[PDB]
């Protein structure tokens, strides 16, 4: 069952049989920078996928297990240890020190994210996460979702957490 | 709403009339259509009770005279009133032989589950209804039940604050309180209906009129091959109800129960607390109150029995975890040399003879507790009936503890009996 | 992918007919081709009575009422077997009687003796001399 | 009436049970798939996500 | 169960003990 | 929060109460057998203490009204105590588990001849009451002794263990039923279970077992301690066999027979290392081969197979004979 | 603590915690007080043996300290 | 024949996953399977919005609310061409008074007219010279 497992948002895909593909991109630039997720799916599926992320982005404002975080954690030190090709470790190199002037070594980083806590998370969730804009976009088969293709109450109640997955969980 | 899944059938006029011109009943005995003849007992306390409400005027001061005269002045207004309180006793009688029929063939299995508890709660709304109902009579037995009734009520929030006035204003019968009982009273008699109505067509998921999984699969077509039976097994108790009553009543009688009933609120003031009695149905708690003269342990009580009554499937039943379930056990860790016992698996109905023995013991305390008003007048001055107390105690823990039903004993002589038996056979 | 299940999964599909009148041009879809959708209890209503049941090679055999007694098998023998040896030997007590007379007669006297102890205290209390 | 509901009821089920079963013995290359990839429960709904997971 | 039949009690209803109330009824048959 | 290192946890959790909590390789919940551990409890109450002494005691008294009875009772109605212990009528009537079990694993007349053998007597019982069952269903009835039916049950339930109970992981939970009653609303499943705040994690190492002692022990001789090779120990062996034959009537053998010690014995010692030739080689090869048998899971001859159907449109869904030359 | 609780239960951070200090340092600079070794890779070693059943096992010397990587092969 | 269609038809069949427990083994099947059913109301809700809508190389955007006027456009001209002429002369009249002056008119003109001629003759009755 879906319900077995440590990944909150894995819970939720596992139930949708149609949602296929999901991946959370973070790309950083000098000025700025977009954290968000990418659905894939059948369009009946639609809300599901649209308010789906951030519901559970918001959620870690409020609580977030242990066991997440030590997911995230363990996933982290691997990925860590994974950069092994010359060639993605020589871009990795050369982003770091042209957006920091410094090659950042994999202790470093491992001491910054372990040190997270709960609390940690659930504050900067609620920094960058809570109760803040989106930019949404949906390409493809939009029948069902033009009746809220507008950036309305449905829209701007979704980023906060248990308040706003009315629509999600229907259907 | 994302934790209610549904429900299990949509109660609409087309598909309710296509269920029932469609279900199917297998065969079956008198003591597994104890439920019918509740839901009859229901429907004609709902005509009569309609055609009473029509009649009863809701000022305690002209109840009375409204009922006596109107049963001169009108024909049938009178055997309307008689039909109605008959349908009371008969409608308890039902319902607390369908509970034992039920506890007897342990149907607190998960499968149950739902049909179970939409039964209870049922029941448990019977209650509330029943006790409006004696509020309208505007007696003695009126007041005394109201007053305890609020003070139950009044227990809850330490006395503090009137919180019952929005029903039991004053504490008293008067025109307000009266109205509103009265209402709620008819409300609650035909949301009753309803709640009957659900409880059916759940249990209908897993029906057996006997424990024993019987091989058949033809079954009898419900419109009239089973209703028929239903009906004339309902003409057959009452026709021994009716010799019972006959000859267990005689016509004049000394010292009957009704006389606690001669007093009227407002005409009379003096109560002769001498001799205060319910109704047989309500005696039981009366009883407990009078044994257990604490108020909120006899309060704990009666709510723990209602309680424990519902929940039922949840301490005995499989839970899910197919027997794998580890109880907790005073004294039988020292001689298993374990802090848990896995629980037993075979707990059959008509083949062992402990469950019937617990069962029959259960059932004679439930009777012997019915059975008299224990008289508080001297009753603890004069050390009280054991057996009231013994009664008790046993229907408090049968219904809770799973010792006295699921016990172990059985499952480990039959293991034993297994391994002597194999091993000599190899 | 472009592909109905993404191209990496495959989707137990199914456009219902339900919701929809017509299968082409301007003819009606059948009126029960929603009971085409097996398994499902909005289907119909016979769906509730789904016990576990299979056979291979069974065959039964029932005869209409016409042409059986009206009441079979009613007094075979005399009252003695039908009666006395049956109803009341085989029936209340091989299944009734025999499970309940010892809990019950065991309440039944313990009842009894309290009550009698009770009302004996009660003679006390009232009488003296 | 008690004889009528008798004659309705009792006997008219004592009748219904007059059935004679035969059972034989089916030796064909057909598997009973039927058996093993089959079955409806109406409850299924509260035994889905909930038990034996 | 058996309710005393000289308590004062008829078949088991408690109170009426100072009053005469078999008379015509229980014993004796009016 | 977390439930470990709560406060209670930290002050009686510790390493000075040996409460601390241990964390060692991951392992399956539900990691005790329940046959076994019945086989072992059931072994520790009657055979040892006190309470083996009040056990030994009431054994007439358990006998006559625990097995007899149901004993009695499955015969009048033309059963035996499998009917009624292999596989119980809850779970044969109204049961999703054993449900999906028996349809994934079990071929299909395990359970049909079950439901068979009741209808026999249903279908008499409920036309006419206090049906008791003729003397030649009653024979093959007793025919089968308990000494099959509990190696049938304990098959069943180790298989039931090792294949399903063994890849099952309990949740805390909601109310299962979907019903708008406030009671059943607040059903809360997981607290007040011995297992779920016994071990916090998959990892945690197991507190309280069967020692492997016990467990030896228990695979013993049931009926006492003796020694089969000293004649005196054979005696008194001998004797409560005998007695126990006695109590329960077809557990090992007919009621009116006695049983063959020496092939017991004969069987013992082809099991274990003790060998000798004491024992006629007809026995030997008479239990050799019996022991074969018992053993041997029955196959299919692939012999006597009925026909197979390849049905056919009829003669009026098909064209007409005739056929001319088109053009 | 009872001040990591506090500052916890109101969403608010905690300014004196060291944790909070490391998690909101400056990207362009190292962190205050943690520093990992240097470390060079050596060279890989391979090495097989047979257990007495028949399994044989090959293993590689780590070259440089990264995660462990471990695998069973069938020639079914 | 033995085949599913009995040879003659192709029957549209589907195994609902509904009133199933377990897809496979003792795994669960998805919590949300029914929904793939298509073109049923009894699948969800939604399905109620059934109006008729088919577009190709469309593209909306829709702004935040918290990008923009919370009272927009309002008095954008001058406070006669906001009110005077666009609500009084554009929204009132154009839309509502333009459309019943007339039939109104007629009618309250001809129930003055009977009610003053009812009202005369009631006077007659009541008063003499
Ligand atoms: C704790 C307390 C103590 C313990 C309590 C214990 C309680 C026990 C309760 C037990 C309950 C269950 C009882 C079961 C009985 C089973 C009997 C049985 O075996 O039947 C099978 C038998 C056939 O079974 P079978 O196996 O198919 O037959 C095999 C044969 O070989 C072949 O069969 P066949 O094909 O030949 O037969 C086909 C059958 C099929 O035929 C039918 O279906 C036709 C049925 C027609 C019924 C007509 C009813 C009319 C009613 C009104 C009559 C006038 C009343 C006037 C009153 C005032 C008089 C002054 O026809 C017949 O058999 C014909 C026989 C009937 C002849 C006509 C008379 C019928 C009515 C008789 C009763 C009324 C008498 C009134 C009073 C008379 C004076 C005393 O069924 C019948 O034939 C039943 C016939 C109807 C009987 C009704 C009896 C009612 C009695 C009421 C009156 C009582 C006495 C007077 C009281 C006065 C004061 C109030
Ligand atoms: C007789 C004369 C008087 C008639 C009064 C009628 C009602 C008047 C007010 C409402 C008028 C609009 C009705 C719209 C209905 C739309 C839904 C619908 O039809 O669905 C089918 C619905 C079943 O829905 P379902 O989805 O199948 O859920 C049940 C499942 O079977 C699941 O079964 P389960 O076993 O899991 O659950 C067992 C049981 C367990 O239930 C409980 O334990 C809960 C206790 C029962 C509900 C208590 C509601 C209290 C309402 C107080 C209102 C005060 C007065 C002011 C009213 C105006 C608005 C404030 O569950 C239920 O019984 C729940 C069903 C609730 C039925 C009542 C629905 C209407 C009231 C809803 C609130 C107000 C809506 C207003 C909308 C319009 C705007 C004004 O069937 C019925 O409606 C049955 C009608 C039975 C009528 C007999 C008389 C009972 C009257 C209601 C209960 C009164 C209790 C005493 C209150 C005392 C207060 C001091
Ligand atoms: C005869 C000679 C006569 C000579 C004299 C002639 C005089 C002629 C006068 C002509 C007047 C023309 C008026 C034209 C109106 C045009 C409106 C318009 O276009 O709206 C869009 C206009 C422009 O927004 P936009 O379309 O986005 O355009 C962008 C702008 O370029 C830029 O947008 P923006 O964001 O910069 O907008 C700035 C805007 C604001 O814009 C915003 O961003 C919205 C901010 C909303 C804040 C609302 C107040 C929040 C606090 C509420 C109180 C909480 C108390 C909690 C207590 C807890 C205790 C435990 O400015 C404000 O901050 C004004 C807000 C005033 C709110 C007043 C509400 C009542 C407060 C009551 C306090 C009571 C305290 C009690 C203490 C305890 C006592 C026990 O937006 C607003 O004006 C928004 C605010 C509207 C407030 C309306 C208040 C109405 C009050 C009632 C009617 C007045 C009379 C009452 C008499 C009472 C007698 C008893
Ligand atoms: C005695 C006591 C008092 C009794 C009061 C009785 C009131 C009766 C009202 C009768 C009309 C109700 C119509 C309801 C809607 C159905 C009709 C409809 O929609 O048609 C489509 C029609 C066309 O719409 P469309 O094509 O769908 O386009 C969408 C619209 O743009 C969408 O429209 P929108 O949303 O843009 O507009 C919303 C609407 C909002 O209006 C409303 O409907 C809201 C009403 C709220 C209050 C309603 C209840 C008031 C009750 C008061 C008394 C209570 C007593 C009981 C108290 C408690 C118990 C004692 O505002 C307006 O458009 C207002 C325009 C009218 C303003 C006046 C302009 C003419 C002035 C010069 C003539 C003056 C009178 C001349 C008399 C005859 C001689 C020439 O809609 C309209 O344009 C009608 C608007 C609503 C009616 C306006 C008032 C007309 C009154 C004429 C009465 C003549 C009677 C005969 C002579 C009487 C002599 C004394
Ligand atoms: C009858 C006598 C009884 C004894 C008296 C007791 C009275 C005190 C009653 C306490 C219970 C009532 C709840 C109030 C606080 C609940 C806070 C909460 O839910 O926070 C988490 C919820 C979480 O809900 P959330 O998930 O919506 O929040 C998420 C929001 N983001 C993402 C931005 C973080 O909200 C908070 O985070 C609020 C934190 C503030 C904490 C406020 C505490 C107030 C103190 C209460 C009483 C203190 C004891 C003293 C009482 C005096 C008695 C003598
Ligand atoms: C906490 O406090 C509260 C309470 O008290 C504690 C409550 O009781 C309640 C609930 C209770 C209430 C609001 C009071 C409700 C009371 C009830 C339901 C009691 C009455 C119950 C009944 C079953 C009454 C039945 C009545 C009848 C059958 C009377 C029949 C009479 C008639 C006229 C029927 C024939 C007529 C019609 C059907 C009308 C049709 C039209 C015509 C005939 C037209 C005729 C005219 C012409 C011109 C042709 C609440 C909510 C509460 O909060
Ligand atoms: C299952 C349904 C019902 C039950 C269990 C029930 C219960 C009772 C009880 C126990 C009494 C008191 C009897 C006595 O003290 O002897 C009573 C009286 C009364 N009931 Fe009900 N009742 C039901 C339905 C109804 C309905 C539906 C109505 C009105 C529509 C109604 C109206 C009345 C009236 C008016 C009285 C008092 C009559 C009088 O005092 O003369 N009852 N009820
Ligand atoms: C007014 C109250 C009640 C009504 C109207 C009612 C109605 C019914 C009816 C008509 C049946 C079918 C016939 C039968 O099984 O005899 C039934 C069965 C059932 N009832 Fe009730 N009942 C009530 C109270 C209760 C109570 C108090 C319980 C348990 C505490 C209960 C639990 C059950 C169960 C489990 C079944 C199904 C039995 C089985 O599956 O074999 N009901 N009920």
Redesign the interface.
């Known amino acids: 069952?879906?319900?077995?497992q440590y990944s909150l948002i894995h819970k939720e895909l596992?139930?949708?049989?149609?949602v296929?593909?999901h991946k959370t991109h973070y790309l950083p630039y000098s000025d700025t920078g977009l954290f968000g997720s990418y659905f894939?799916?059948?369009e009946?599926?639609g809300?599901?996928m649209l308010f789906l992320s951030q519901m559970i982005l918001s959620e870690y404002?409020?609580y977030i297990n242990?066991a997440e975080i030590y997911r995230a954690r363990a996933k982290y030190f691997?990925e860590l240890?994974?950069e092994?090709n010359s060639a993605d470790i020589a871009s990795s190199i050369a982003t770091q020190v042209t957006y920091?002037?410094?090659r950042?070594?994999?202790?470093?980083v491992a001491?910054?994210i372990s040190?997270?806590?709960?609390?940690?998370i659930?504050?900067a969730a609620?920094r960058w996460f809570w109760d803040k804009?989106?930019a949404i976009v949906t390409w493809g088969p939009s029948?069902?979702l033009?009746?809220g293709?507008?950036?309305n109450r449905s829209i701007?109640r979704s980023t906060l957490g248990w308040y706003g997955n009315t629509h999600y969980?229907?259907? | 709403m994302e934790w209610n899944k549904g429900t299990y059938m949509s109660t609409s006029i087309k598909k309710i009339v296509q269920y029932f011109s469609v279900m199917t009943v297998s065969f079956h005995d008198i003591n597994s259509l104890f439920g019918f003849f509740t839901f009859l007992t229901i429907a004609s306390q709902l005509v009569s009770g309609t055609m009473l409400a029509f009649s009863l005027v809701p000022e305690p001061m002209l109840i009375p005279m409204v009922r006596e005269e109107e049963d001169v002045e009108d024909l049938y207004t009178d055997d309307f009133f008689w039909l109605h309180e008959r349908g009371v006793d008969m409608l308890f009688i039902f319902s607390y032989f369908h509970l034992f029929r039920k506890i007897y063939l342990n149907n607190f299995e998960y499968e149950q589950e739902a049909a179970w508890k939409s039964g209870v709660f049922t029941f448990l709304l019977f209650q509330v209804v029943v006790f409006l109902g004696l509020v309208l009579c505007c007696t003695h037995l009126s007041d005394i039940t109201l007053a305890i009734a609020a003070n139950l009520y009044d227990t809850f929030f330490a006395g503090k604050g009137k919180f019952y006035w929005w029903i039991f204003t004053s504490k008293e019968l008067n025109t307000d309180t009266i109205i509103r009982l009265a209402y709620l009273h008819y409300v609650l008699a035909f949301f009753l209906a309803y709640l009957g109505l659900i409880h059916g067509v759940d249990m209908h998921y897993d029906w057996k009129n006997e424990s024993s999984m019987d091989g058949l699969e033809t079954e009898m077509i419900w419109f009239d091959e089973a209703l028929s039976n239903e009906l004339g097994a309902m003409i057959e108790i009452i026709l021994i109800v009716m010799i019972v009553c006959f000859f267990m009543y005689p016509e004049p009688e000394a010292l009957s129960y009704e006389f606690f009933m001669w007093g009227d609120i407002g005409f009379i003031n003096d109560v002769r607390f001498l001799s205060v009695a319910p109704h047989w149905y309500f005696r039981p708690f009366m009883a407990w109150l009078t044994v257990c003269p604490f108020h909120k342990i006899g309060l704990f009580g009666l709510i723990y029995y209602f309680f424990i009554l519902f929940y039922q499937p949840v301490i005995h039943g499989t839970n899910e975890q197919n027997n794998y379930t580890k109880r907790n056990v005073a004294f039988v860790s020292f001689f298993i040399n374990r802090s848990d016992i896995m629980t037993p698996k075979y707990h059959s109905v008509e083949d062992n003879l402990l469950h019937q023995i617990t069962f029959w013991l259960f059932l004679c305390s439930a009777l012997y507790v019915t059975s008299y008003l224990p008289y508080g007048r001297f009753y603890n001055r004069i050390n009280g009936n054991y057996g009231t107390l013994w009664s008790f105690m046993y229907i408090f823990f049968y219904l809770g503890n799973s010792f006295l039903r699921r016990p172990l004993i059985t499952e480990l002589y039959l293991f034993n009996a297994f391994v002597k038996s194999k091993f000599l056979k190899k | 992918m472009n592909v109905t299940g993404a191209g990496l999964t495959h989707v137990k599909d199914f456009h219902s007919d339900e919701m929809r009148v017509f299968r082409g041009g301007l003819r009606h879809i059948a009126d029960k081709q929603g009971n085409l959708i097996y398994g499902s209890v909005n289907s119909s209503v016979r769906y509730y009575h789904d016990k576990m049941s299979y056979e291979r090679g069974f065959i039964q055999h029932s005869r209409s009422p016409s042409n059986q007694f009206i009441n079979f098998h009613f007094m075979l023998g005399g009252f003695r077997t039908y009666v006395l040896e049956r109803f009341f030997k085989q029936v209340w007590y091989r299944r009734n009687i025999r499970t309940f007379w010892f809990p019950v007669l065991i309440s039944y006297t313990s009842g009894c003796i309290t009550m009698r102890m009770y009302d004996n205290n009660c003679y006390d209390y009232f009488y003296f001399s | 009436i008690l004889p009528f509901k008798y004659f309705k009821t009792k006997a008219y089920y004592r009748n219904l049970l007059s059935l004679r079963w035969e059972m034989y013995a089916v030796r064909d290359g057909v598997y009973y798939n039927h058996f093993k990839y089959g079955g409806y429960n109406s409850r299924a709904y509260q035994f889905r996500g909930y038990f034996w997971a | 169960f058996i309710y005393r039949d000289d308590i004062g009690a008829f078949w088991g209803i408690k109170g009426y003990e100072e009053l005469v109330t078999e008379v015509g009824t229980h014993k004796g048959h009016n | 929060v977390r439930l470990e290192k709560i406060l209670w946890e930290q002050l009686v959790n510790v390493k000075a109460f040996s409460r601390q909590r241990v964390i060692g390789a991951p392992s399956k919940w539900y990691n005790e057998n329940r046959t076994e551990w019945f086989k072992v409890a059931q072994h520790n109450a009657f055979n040892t203490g006190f309470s083996g002494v009040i056990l030994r005691a009431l054994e007439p008294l358990l006998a006559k009204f625990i097995y007899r009875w149901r004993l009695d009772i499955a015969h009048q109605r033309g059963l035996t105590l499998e009917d009624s212990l292999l596989f119980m009528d809850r779970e044969l009537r109204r049961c999703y588990f054993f449900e999906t079990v028996a349809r994934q694993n079990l071929h299909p007349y395990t359970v049909l001849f079950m439901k068979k053998r009741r209808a026999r007597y249903y279908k008499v019982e409920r036309g006419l009451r206090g049906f008791y069952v003729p003397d030649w269903v009653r024979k093959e009835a007793e025919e089968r002794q308990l000494s099959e039916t509990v190696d049938n049950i304990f098959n069943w339930e180790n298989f039931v263990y090792r294949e399903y109970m063994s890849d099952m992981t309990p949740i805390g939970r909601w109310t299962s039923l979907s019903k708008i009653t406030p009671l059943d609303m607040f059903q809360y499943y997981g607290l007040f279970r011995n297992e779920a705040w016994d071990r916090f994690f998959y990892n945690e190492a197991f507190y309280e077992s069967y020692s492997e002692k016990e467990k030896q022990e228990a695979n013993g001789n049931p009926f006492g301690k003796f020694n089969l090779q000293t004649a005196d120990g054979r005696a008194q062996f001998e004797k409560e066999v005998n007695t126990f034959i006695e109590r329960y009537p077809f557990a090992v053998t007919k009621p009116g027979q006695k049983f063959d010690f020496t092939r017991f014995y004969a069987l013992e010692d082809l099991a274990n290392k003790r060998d000798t030739s004491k024992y006629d080689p007809a026995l030997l090869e008479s239990v050799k081969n019996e022991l074969k048998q018992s053993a041997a899971l029955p196959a299919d001859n692939g012999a006597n197979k009925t026909k197979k159907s390849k049905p056919i449109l009829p003669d009026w869904l098909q064209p007409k004979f005739g056929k001319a030359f088109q053009a | 603590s009872v001040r990591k609780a506090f500052y916890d239960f109101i969403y608010k951070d905690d300014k004196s915690a060291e944790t909070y200090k490391v998690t909101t340092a400056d990207p362009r600079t190292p962190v205050q007080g943690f520093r990992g070794q240097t470390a060079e890779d050596v060279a890989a070693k391979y090495e097989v043996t047979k257990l007495a059943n028949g399994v044989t096992i090959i293993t590689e010397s780590q070259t440089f300290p990264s995660q462990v990587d471990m695998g069973i092969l069938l020639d079914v």
């Open positions: 069952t879906s319900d077995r596992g139930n949708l049989p149609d296929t593909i894939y799916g059948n009946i599926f809300n599901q404002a409020s242990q691997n240890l994974a092994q920091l002037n410094r950042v070594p994999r202790s470093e001491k910054r040190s997270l806590d709960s609390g940690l659930n504050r609620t804009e989106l029948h069902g033009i009746a293709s507008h950036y701007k969980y229907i259907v």
